[PDB]
Amino acid sequence: MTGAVCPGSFDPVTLGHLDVFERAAAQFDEVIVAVLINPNKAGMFTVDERIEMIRESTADLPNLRVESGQGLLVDFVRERGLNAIVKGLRTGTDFEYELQMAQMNKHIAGVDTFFVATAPAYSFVSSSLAKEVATYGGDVSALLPASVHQRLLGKLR
Amino acid sequence: MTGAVCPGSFDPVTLGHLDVFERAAAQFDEVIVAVLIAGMFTVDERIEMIRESTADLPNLRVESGQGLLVDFVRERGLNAIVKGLRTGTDFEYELQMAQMNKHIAGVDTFFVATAPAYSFVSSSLAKEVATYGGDVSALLPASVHQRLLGKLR
Amino acid sequence: MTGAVCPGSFDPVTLGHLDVFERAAAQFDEVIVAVLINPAGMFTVDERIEMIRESTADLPNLRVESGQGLLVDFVRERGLNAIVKGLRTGTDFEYELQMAQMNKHIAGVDTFFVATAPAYSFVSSSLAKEVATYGGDVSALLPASVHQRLLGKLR
Amino acid sequence: MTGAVCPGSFDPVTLGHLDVFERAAAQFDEVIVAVLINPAGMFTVDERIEMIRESTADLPNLRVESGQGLLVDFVRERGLNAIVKGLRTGTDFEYELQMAQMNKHIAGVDTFFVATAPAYSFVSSSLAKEVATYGGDVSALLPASVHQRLLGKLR
Amino acid sequence: MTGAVCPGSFDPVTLGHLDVFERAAAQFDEVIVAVLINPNKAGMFTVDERIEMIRESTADLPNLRVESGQGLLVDFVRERGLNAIVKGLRTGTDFEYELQMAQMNKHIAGVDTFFVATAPAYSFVSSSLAKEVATYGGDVSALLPASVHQRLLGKLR
Amino acid sequence: MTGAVCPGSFDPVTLGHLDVFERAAAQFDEVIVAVLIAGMFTVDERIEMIRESTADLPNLRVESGQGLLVDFVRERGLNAIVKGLRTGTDFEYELQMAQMNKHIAGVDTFFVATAPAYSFVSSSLAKEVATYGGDVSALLPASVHQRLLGKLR
Numbered sequence: 019m020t021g022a023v024c025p026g027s028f029d030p031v032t033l034g035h036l037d038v039f040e041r042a043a044a045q046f047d048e049v050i051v052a053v054l055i056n057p058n059k060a061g062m063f064t065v066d067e068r069i070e071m072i073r074e075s076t077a078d079l080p081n082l083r084v085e086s087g088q089g090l091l092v093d094f095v096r097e098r099g100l101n102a103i104v105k106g107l108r109t110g111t112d113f114e115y116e117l118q119m120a121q122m123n124k125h126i127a128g129v130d131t132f133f134v135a136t137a138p139a140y141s142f143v144s145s146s147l148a149k150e151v152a153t154y155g156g157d158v159s160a161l162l163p164a165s166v167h168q169r170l171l172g173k174l175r
Numbered sequence: 176m177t178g179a180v181c182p183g184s185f186d187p188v189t190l191g192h193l194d195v196f197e198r199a200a201a202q203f204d205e206v207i208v209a210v211l212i213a214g215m216f217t218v219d220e221r222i223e224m225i226r227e228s229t230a231d232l233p234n235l236r237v238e239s240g241q242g243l244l245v246d247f248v249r250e251r252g253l254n255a256i257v258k259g260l261r262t263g264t265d266f267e268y269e270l271q272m273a274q275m276n277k278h279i280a281g282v283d284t285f286f287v288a289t290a291p292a293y294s295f296v297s298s299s300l301a302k303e304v305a306t307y308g309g310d311v312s313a314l315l316p317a318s319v320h321q322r323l324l325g326k327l328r
Numbered sequence: 329m330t331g332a333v334c335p336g337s338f339d340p341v342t343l344g345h346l347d348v349f350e351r352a353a354a355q356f357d358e359v360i361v362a363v364l365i366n367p368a369g370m371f372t373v374d375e376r377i378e379m380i381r382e383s384t385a386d387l388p389n390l391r392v393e394s395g396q397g398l399l400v401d402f403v404r405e406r407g408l409n410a411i412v413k414g415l416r417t418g419t420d421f422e423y424e425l426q427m428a429q430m431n432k433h434i435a436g437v438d439t440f441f442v443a444t445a446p447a448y449s450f451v452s453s454s455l456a457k458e459v460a461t462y463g464g465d466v467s468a469l470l471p472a473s474v475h476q477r478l479l480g481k482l483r
Numbered sequence: 484m485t486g487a488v489c490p491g492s493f494d495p496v497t498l499g500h501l502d503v504f505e506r507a508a509a510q511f512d513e514v515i516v517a518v519l520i521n522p523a524g525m526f527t528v529d530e531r532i533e534m535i536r537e538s539t540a541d542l543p544n545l546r547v548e549s550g551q552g553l554l555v556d557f558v559r560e561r562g563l564n565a566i567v568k569g570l571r572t573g574t575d576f577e578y579e580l581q582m583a584q585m586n587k588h589i590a591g592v593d594t595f596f597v598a599t600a601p602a603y604s605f606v607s608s609s610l611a612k613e614v615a616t617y618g619g620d621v622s623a624l625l626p627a628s629v630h631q632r633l634l635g636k637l638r
Numbered sequence: 639m640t641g642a643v644c645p646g647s648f649d650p651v652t653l654g655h656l657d658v659f660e661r662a663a664a665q666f667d668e669v670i671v672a673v674l675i676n677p678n679k680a681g682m683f684t685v686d687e688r689i690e691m692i693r694e695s696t697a698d699l700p701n702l703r704v705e706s707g708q709g710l711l712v713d714f715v716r717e718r719g720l721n722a723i724v725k726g727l728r729t730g731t732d733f734e735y736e737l738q739m740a741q742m743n744k745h746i747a748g749v750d751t752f753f754v755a756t757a758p759a760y761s762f763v764s765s766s767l768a769k770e771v772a773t774y775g776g777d778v779s780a781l782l783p784a785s786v787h788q789r790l791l792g793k794l795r
Numbered sequence: 796m797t798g799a800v801c802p803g804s805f806d807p808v809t810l811g812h813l814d815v816f817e818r819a820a821a822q823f824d825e826v827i828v829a830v831l832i833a834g835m836f837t838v839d840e841r842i843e844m845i846r847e848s849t850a851d852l853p854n855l856r857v858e859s860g861q862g863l864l865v866d867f868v869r870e871r872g873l874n875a876i877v878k879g880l881r882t883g884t885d886f887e888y889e890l891q892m893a894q895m896n897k898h899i900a901g902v903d904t905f906f907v908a909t910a911p912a913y914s915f916v917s918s919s920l921a922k923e924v925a926t927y928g929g930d931v932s933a934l935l936p937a938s939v940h941q942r943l944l945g946k947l948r
């Protein structure tokens with residue numbers, strides 16, 4: 019009954035995210051993708067859109083499920099009877115901030131954070147840079163799942 | 176006649192800050208905590224919270240400031256800054272500012288790492304965690320923690 | 329015929345920027361300084377271009393132009409496929425590397441990084457403006473014509 | 484059935500190592516601590532294994548084994564394909580990342596990194612031995628049985 | 639008449655190196671690969687072997703040549719009428735040391751150093767890690783040019 | 796009665812080191828340069844070179860040391876170390892040692908960046924460059940530079 023939570027805003031999910039989801043699902047009995055929402059700032063995609071895009075690109079992972087939440091990540095994790103977070107690393111990750119949050123999260127709730135580096139091919143995509151590049155016409159089709167790419171272009175138009 | 180200034184917004188002061196204050200006060204004759212001024216606490220509240228937490232440091236005082244930090248330092252006859260390092264410090268930006276501050280006013284900056292126990296608290300993360308019900312009581316002065324609970328509730 | 333683009337907001341241009349411009353101009357047949365405008369700063373795009381031209385008067389193979397949108401489009405539209413970017417103290421290098429890999433992926437454009445000289449390594453447009461606003465002397469860190477204009481915008 | 488390997492020389496095992504072992508054992512069905520021998524240190528491989536077993540007596544799903552050669556072969560030979568590595572102050576993380584990407588490429592093995600607790604973040608096997616050699620007290624940073632053995636090797 | 643020097647021990651050359659050579663050759667009129675030799679410590683390959691492996695994998699680059707040297711890199715550069723170095727960045731690069739050397743090299747000889755990141759696919763290979771992995775049987779065939787791989791295995795056997 | 800120890804091998808002392816010594820001497824009543832002991836110069840040579848370069852610093856002295864740095868510091872009634880930062884400093888390792896030194900002996904470590912002009916020299920790189928005929932005269936005290944040329948030629 020091992021398990022981990024993969025957290026993020028996933029606005030939208032990228033192939034970097036999906037790589038890490040797949041690794042987590044391969045190494046833990048269950049994985050929950052936590053789509054964390056700031057109720058004060060809307061992103062590009064609604065919560066239901068974000069969840070749909072993740073589900074469509076994770077259909078081959080039988081032990082992965084997707085749920086939204088807000089507030090403290092460690093509460094989302096513990097209320098599901100888990101105490102592990104799996105977080106991806108990419109080029110441009112603020113690792114010092116991630117470390118700070120990992121030590122705080124262990125301190126307040128006993129939850130462990132495991133970091134895994136995304137595959138090199140997917141190491142320079144981020145939701146924010148993908149959106150920025152696509153806004154001005156750049157081709158990010160190879161860095162996003164099919165469940166995302168044309169929906170992104172749709173939002174931008 | 177040695178002295179150093181420990182600058183920050185301290186909104187609120189943490190045990191990470193206090194650890195650095197104590198070290199500065201142990202190694203310099205005179206220490207001034209510079210409360211540099213839309214956060215949670217007013218300048219007076221932040222000053223009071225620091226003063227309450229530093230009552231056992233006779234050679235430390237707390238003053239508010241505006242404008243260039245180096246002017247604050249120099250106008251008090253000093254030319255040293257002591258700055259703490261924690262997990263999540265943007266050290267590259269601190270180094271840029273240190274070199275600029277030396278260039279424009281001949282002020283030295285000394286960096287000291289906070290104790291491991293207080294290395295992952297920051298004013299911002301403490302406020303965030305407490306806002307959502309997390310227990311940060313081990314990371315703040317007893318006084319500050321009660322005040323924080325007051326501002327939230 | 330070789331060439332590179334040096335991109336930035338240059339608000340205002342610093343001696344750190346100038347150092348990198350000079351090194352680019354010494355190593356490439358053609359250099360374009362791209363003054364890239366956003367939706368915002370202290371100097372107008374025209375003022376920024378003028379300050380750069382004043383500072384680069386001795387560089388005959390360097391020209392200054394404004395641009396918007398995707399940097400790699402600016403680069404490719406001028407028949408080039410290289411960017412030269414400066415490094416200074418406080419550069420977010422991890423983000424620069426992310427953008428370099430992205431720019432190579434989407435358009436085949438290479439990015440070359442060069443560290444500015446130690447003397448000019450701690451100036452940035454933002455920090456120079458901040459220090460000058462409160463009366464600090466940054467005249468050793470900016471071209472002379474820029475320092476004059478900066479005082480005017482503040483006074 | 485999930486599982487991971489925690490690799491190192493562990494000469495000697497520290498409380499930083501133990502912290503990471505405990506977290507691995509709490510999150511994976513099976514953990515193997517791989518004591519990997521080189522062509523060399525203070526403690527023999529047998530002594531190191533014994534010190535780890537003493538320290539991990541409360542972890543029934545963790546076992547300790549020696550190994551040589553390619554780590555990913557050690558991992559795959561035991562039917563696993565995950566490594567759990569600790570991070571501390573002074574870890575060469577850039578090199579760890581290079582090795583993680585290499586290990587994924589050559590064998591499909593994933594590497595998960597976890598930071599040790601702040602209290603145990605500045606101890607390392609090498610620095611503990613160095614401090615103890617000159618009479619510094621590192622007893623708060625090592626399992627009790629290790630600290631006893633360390634004194635013996637020095638005296 | 640622009641030009642740059644790409645320096646290294648290249649013992650052996652990797653596909654990470656070759657990527658950077660190709661970019662340099664695309665952006666400068668001439669490129670010299672400088673195979674820098676420590677006369678006090680032999681590597682795995684002799685100088686002539688190193689040069690042969692680079693030449694065989696750079697035959698499509700008409701403006702690139704390969705030469706060995708020792709002592710100060712800036713003297714190698716200036717004696718060829720050049721004053722630019724192009725150096726690759728990969729995962730595990732000691733960038734702070736590279737920066738130190740770049741500032742020293744500018745100080746003593748006026749030579750500029752341009753850094754370029756290797757392609758993600760080739761970002762985790764290094765000569766040393768390739769040799770180490772191959773020593774213990776790991777498959778590094780996709781990270782090295784054909785001019786290198788079986789020669790490497792030969793040395794190891 | 797403030798004081799700090801500036802430790803290193805100083806083989807040889809550079810202008811980067813000297814800049815940090817001067818800053819330490821400006822901000823602490825008492826400074827001890829600890830020459831911690833197969834390099835180029837003997838301990839006595841390194842001490843002499845530092846003493847020659849610091850003749851204008853009345854509150855600085857130079858002594859050799861062995862074993863734990865914290866014992867060197869504590870045996871002289873102090874509990875502060877001042878360490879310089881340059882381009883190529885392994886800062887993560889320095890932080891590890893600082894936290895260890897605080898833990899085992901209550902000694903604080905203050906870090907200060909060298910001036911930009913002296914930020915890319917190190918004893919090792921200076922020796923390497925000079926060995927192959929490079930001019931490092933702008934990066935070393937005048938005395939040291941002549942001595943270095945002597946050891947090579």
Ligand SMILES: O=C(O)Cn1ccc2ccccc21
Nearest residue numbers: 025026034035038105106107
């Ligand atoms: O996208 C990022 O900034 C980092 N990152 C990359 C993969 C991944 C998976 C889960 C959470 C974060 C992740």
Ligand SMILES: O=C(O)Cn1ccc2ccccc21
Nearest residue numbers: 182183191192195258259260
């Ligand atoms: O809180 C931070 O971000 C860093 N930090 C830690 C202690 C301390 C004391 C004075 C100034 C900053 C300080």
Ligand SMILES: O=C(O)Cn1ccc2ccccc21
Nearest residue numbers: 334336344345348413414415
């Ligand atoms: O100013 C910066 O943030 C970095 N930087 C320094 C020189 C330079 C030249 C072109 C672009 C950026 C450059």
Ligand SMILES: O=C(O)Cn1ccc2ccccc21
Nearest residue numbers: 489491499500503568569570
């Ligand atoms: O000791 C180190 O250098 C890092 N480190 C810390 C805990 C731990 C556990 C397994 C492997 C390495 C680990």
Ligand SMILES: O=C(O)Cn1ccc2ccccc21
Nearest residue numbers: 645646654655658725726727
């Ligand atoms: O291999 C390395 O350590 C770094 N690196 C990567 C490509 C490349 C090309 C020339 C010189 C060094 C280079």
Ligand SMILES: O=C(O)Cn1ccc2ccccc21
Nearest residue numbers: 802803811812815878879880
């Ligand atoms: O030289 C170095 O590696 C760092 N560094 C620079 C100045 C200085 C002074 C004392 C100790 C180390 C110092």
